[PDB]
Scaffold this active site. Structure first.
Site, mmCIF file in Angstrom:
data_model
loop_
_atom_site.group_PDB
_atom_site.id
_atom_site.type_symbol
_atom_site.label_atom_id
_atom_site.label_comp_id
_atom_site.label_asym_id
_atom_site.label_seq_id
_atom_site.Cartn_x
_atom_site.Cartn_y
_atom_site.Cartn_z
ATOM 1 N N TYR A 32 0.791 -1.222 0.000
ATOM 2 C CA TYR A 32 0.000 0.000 0.000
ATOM 3 C C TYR A 32 0.826 1.275 0.000
ATOM 4 O O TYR A 32 0.468 2.244 -0.676
ATOM 5 C CB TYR A 32 -0.949 0.023 1.199
ATOM 6 C CG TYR A 32 -1.611 1.369 1.421
ATOM 7 C CD1 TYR A 32 -1.271 2.166 2.512
ATOM 8 C CD2 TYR A 32 -2.557 1.856 0.523
ATOM 9 C CE1 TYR A 32 -1.852 3.416 2.704
ATOM 10 C CE2 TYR A 32 -3.147 3.106 0.706
ATOM 11 C CZ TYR A 32 -2.789 3.877 1.795
ATOM 12 O OH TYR A 32 -3.368 5.111 1.969
ATOM 13 N N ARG A 67 -4.808 -1.959 -1.890
ATOM 14 C CA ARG A 67 -6.216 -1.844 -1.528
ATOM 15 C C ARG A 67 -7.199 -2.374 -2.576
ATOM 16 O O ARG A 67 -8.405 -2.249 -2.409
ATOM 17 C CB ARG A 67 -6.532 -0.391 -1.189
ATOM 18 C CG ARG A 67 -5.761 0.139 0.023
ATOM 19 C CD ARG A 67 -6.232 -0.494 1.329
ATOM 20 N NE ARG A 67 -5.816 0.300 2.480
ATOM 21 C CZ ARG A 67 -4.706 0.095 3.182
ATOM 22 N NH1 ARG A 67 -3.895 -0.908 2.878
ATOM 23 N NH2 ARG A 67 -4.424 0.886 4.205
ATOM 24 N N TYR A 148 -2.822 -1.858 7.614
ATOM 25 C CA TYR A 148 -4.287 -2.013 7.644
ATOM 26 C C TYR A 148 -4.800 -2.814 8.840
ATOM 27 O O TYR A 148 -5.733 -2.388 9.534
ATOM 28 C CB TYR A 148 -4.768 -2.709 6.373
ATOM 29 C CG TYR A 148 -6.262 -2.618 6.136
ATOM 30 C CD1 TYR A 148 -6.817 -1.504 5.512
ATOM 31 C CD2 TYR A 148 -7.121 -3.649 6.530
ATOM 32 C CE1 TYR A 148 -8.183 -1.414 5.278
ATOM 33 C CE2 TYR A 148 -8.494 -3.568 6.303
ATOM 34 C CZ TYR A 148 -9.014 -2.447 5.673
ATOM 35 O OH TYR A 148 -10.364 -2.350 5.422
HETATM 36 N N1 LIG Z 1 -5.631 -5.502 -2.003
HETATM 37 C C1 LIG Z 1 -6.824 -5.680 -1.442
HETATM 38 S S1 LIG Z 1 -7.971 -6.415 -2.324
HETATM 39 C C2 LIG Z 1 -7.182 -5.278 -0.004
HETATM 40 C C3 LIG Z 1 -8.473 -4.740 0.354
HETATM 41 C C4 LIG Z 1 -8.851 -4.357 1.702
HETATM 42 C C5 LIG Z 1 -7.890 -4.525 2.734
HETATM 43 N N2 LIG Z 1 -6.600 -5.063 2.376
HETATM 44 C C6 LIG Z 1 -5.631 -5.217 3.458
HETATM 45 O O1 LIG Z 1 -4.602 -4.201 3.353
HETATM 46 C C7 LIG Z 1 -3.311 -4.738 3.689
HETATM 47 C C8 LIG Z 1 -2.402 -4.559 2.491
HETATM 48 O O2 LIG Z 1 -1.101 -5.060 2.773
HETATM 49 P P1 LIG Z 1 0.178 -4.121 2.578
HETATM 50 O O3 LIG Z 1 1.418 -4.761 2.901
HETATM 51 O O4 LIG Z 1 0.208 -3.382 1.324
HETATM 52 O O5 LIG Z 1 -0.395 -3.003 3.735
HETATM 53 P P2 LIG Z 1 -0.313 -2.187 5.103
HETATM 54 O O6 LIG Z 1 0.145 -3.300 5.798
HETATM 55 O O7 LIG Z 1 -1.576 -1.610 4.747
HETATM 56 O O8 LIG Z 1 0.934 -1.396 4.650
HETATM 57 C C9 LIG Z 1 0.887 -0.006 4.558
HETATM 58 C C10 LIG Z 1 2.296 0.328 4.913
HETATM 59 O O9 LIG Z 1 2.917 1.313 4.109
HETATM 60 C C11 LIG Z 1 3.346 2.396 4.867
HETATM 61 N N3 LIG Z 1 3.115 3.653 4.158
HETATM 62 C C12 LIG Z 1 1.965 4.380 3.986
HETATM 63 N N4 LIG Z 1 2.247 5.482 3.277
HETATM 64 C C13 LIG Z 1 3.532 5.432 3.022
HETATM 65 C C14 LIG Z 1 4.354 6.316 2.329
HETATM 66 N N5 LIG Z 1 3.860 7.423 1.797
HETATM 67 N N6 LIG Z 1 5.730 6.034 2.189
HETATM 68 C C15 LIG Z 1 6.287 4.911 2.719
HETATM 69 N N7 LIG Z 1 5.474 4.060 3.394
HETATM 70 C C16 LIG Z 1 4.112 4.294 3.557
HETATM 71 C C17 LIG Z 1 2.733 2.265 6.273
HETATM 72 O O10 LIG Z 1 3.717 2.505 7.289
HETATM 73 P P3 LIG Z 1 4.117 3.988 7.831
HETATM 74 O O11 LIG Z 1 2.862 4.579 8.363
HETATM 75 O O12 LIG Z 1 5.187 3.738 8.873
HETATM 76 O O13 LIG Z 1 4.711 4.702 6.626
HETATM 77 C C18 LIG Z 1 2.094 0.893 6.313
HETATM 78 O O14 LIG Z 1 2.427 0.174 7.502
HETATM 79 C C19 LIG Z 1 -3.591 -6.215 4.073
HETATM 80 O O15 LIG Z 1 -3.739 -6.346 5.518
HETATM 81 C C20 LIG Z 1 -4.910 -6.547 3.380
HETATM 82 O O16 LIG Z 1 -5.562 -7.663 3.982
HETATM 83 C C21 LIG Z 1 -6.237 -5.438 1.027
#
Ligand SMILES: NC(=S)c1ccc[n+]([C@@H]2O[C@H](COP(=O)([O-])OP(=O)(O)OC[C@H]3O[C@@H](n4cnc5c(N)ncnc54)[C@H](OP(=O)(O)O)[C@@H]3O)[C@@H](O)[C@H]2O)c1
Length: 182
Positions: A32, A67, A148
């Site tokens: 994300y 997302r 998330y």
């Molecule tokens: N893809 C679909 S279909 C979907 C739908 C709904 C929910 N989800 C859920 O969303 C999560 C997605 O996993 P993931 O690994 O991508 O997500 P998260 O675990 O959502 O990862 C976001 C990470 O990126 C960092 N971040 C945010 N903005 C940033 C920026 N500008 N620069 C650098 N880092 C930044 C955050 O840390 P900091 O705040 O420290 O920067 C955060 O911990 C899963 O838990 C999943 O189940 C996915």
């Protein structure tokens, strides 16, 4: 009167370029964060250069990264990344133990080792990119904040993990430039 602490390490840009210039095989796991920052472009440029240097650079995409389904795939393709080096979790996961460097860019929940290490975890069992198995892991996010699932990630305090704090795009623009100065 209870308490528990955790120790994590932070490296600097220059130190980052070293691990990158030193590694032979690299795997990049975006999430994300890479989207929010719109860092597809700089990381794509970097991957291009490293590949012209004989380095093996590939991405590891979690099915539910970001997302929207396949959202990271679209953004990378938009930046120009070769579809051939963008692999899905199930296809690349078995290659972490044989990898030198894993650059975790804006990812967290998708690389959370608590899924396998903590039985009482709300993500216990949930398949995750096993980045902690590679030699060296560099986590690129703004802090040690949660993702998330609002859950702490153990890989932050692991010996082979280094935190390179900052916006995913600022950081990637920097590494991209410094790697060009090589
Ligand atoms: N893809 C679909 S279909 C979907 C739908 C709904 C929910 N989800 C859920 O969303 C999560 C997605 O996993 P993931 O690994 O991508 O997500 P998260 O675990 O959502 O990862 C976001 C990470 O990126 C960092 N971040 C945010 N903005 C940033 C920026 N500008 N620069 C650098 N880092 C930044 C955050 O840390 P900091 O705040 O420290 O920067 C955060 O911990 C899963 O838990 C999943 O189940 C996915």
């Amino acid at each position: 009167p209870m308490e528990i602490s955790g120790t994590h390490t932070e490296i600097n840009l220059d130190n980052a370029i070293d691990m990158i210039r030193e590694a032979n095989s690299i795997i990049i796991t975006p999430g994300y964060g890479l989207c929010a920052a719109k860092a597809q472009y700089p990381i794509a440029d970097l991957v291009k250069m490293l590949t012209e240097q004989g380095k093996k650079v590939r991405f590891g995409i979690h099915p539910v990264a970001g997302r929207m389904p396949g959202q990271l795939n679209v953004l990378l393709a938009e930046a120009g990344v070769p579809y051939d080096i963008v692999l899905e979790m199930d296809e690349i996961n078995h290659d972490f133990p044989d990898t030198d460097l894993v650059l975790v860019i804006g990812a967290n929940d998708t690389v959370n080792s608590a899924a396998q290490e903590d039985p009482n975890s709300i993500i216990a069992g949930m398949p995750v990119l096993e980045v902690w198995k590679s030699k060296q892991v560099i986590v690129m996010k703004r802090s040690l904040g949660v993702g998330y699932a609002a859950v702490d990630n153990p890989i932050f305090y692991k010996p082979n993990t280094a935190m390179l704090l900052g916006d995913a795009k600022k950081t990637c623009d920097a590494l991209q430039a410094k790697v060009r100065e090589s």
